[PDB]
Amino acid sequence: PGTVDKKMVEKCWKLMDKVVRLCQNPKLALKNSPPYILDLLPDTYQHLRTILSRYEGKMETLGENEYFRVFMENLMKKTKQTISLFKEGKERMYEENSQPRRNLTKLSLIFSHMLAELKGIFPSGLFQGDTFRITKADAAEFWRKAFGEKTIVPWKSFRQALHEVHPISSGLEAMALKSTIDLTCNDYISVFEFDIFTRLFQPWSSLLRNWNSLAVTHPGYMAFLTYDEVKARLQKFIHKPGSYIFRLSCTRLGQWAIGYVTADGNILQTIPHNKPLFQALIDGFREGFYLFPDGRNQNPDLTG
């Protein structure tokens, strides 16, 4: 990427200013629940200001920052995609359950994720990518050993390097993998993104094999969905006790968010604590809570 100059941010802001208003339209009837775009942007803007306030002068040190170059870039691109969706989605936006509208929810998550990432690679507003505290030991090794201090790497690289320890089946399996990890949708994998994945799919020992069993071949795994969407979706099995689906959490990044239907026909959502998703699923199924992955009558045998 090129250099990120003071002007650059200006544009991104103007773009952010619009994306908001568009989403401020009543017809959309957007709910407060996160992800909640109407906030993620203001907050993002806010943080960017904090950052820019601290590099106040040493602006070149920042524009130079590889990761920061990426973000703004991705961000700018992302604000646009949203703008288009509206004009090239026209009145179809206000149509709940309309492809154009689903894309909107998607981006929401990204924005939420992006913010999460940014605040991580810039706690306090001062860059700290090269020293990011990776959570699981094992993983932390692989990353610092494979990429050293790099804060963000081209998908390509990450793939090759990863394949040495964890073999990637096909060119397709990898495309799937990439979609799961690349939370900021920018063909780059950051130490932050890396951490979140490795946390969700631990143990590192069998990283991809777990992923395979919890997302590649498991009907319950739901890519980019939100709390609302999970409830909205499980509603077709609304009173088919056992029916459940899982996804990534929006507020508690790095953790799971099961969505299930209670014997008394109700939709709840739990975030596994003190027990890996692997375990939650095994027990829940045993106790009659995690029986039908997304309606499906049959359930995966994680015991393998």
Partner: peptide, 11 residues
């Protein structure tokens, strides 16, 4: 804004 959404693991 704030949540409430999440429920305890039935166990």
């Amino acid at each position: 804004s704030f949540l409430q959404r999440y429920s305890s693991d039935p166990t």
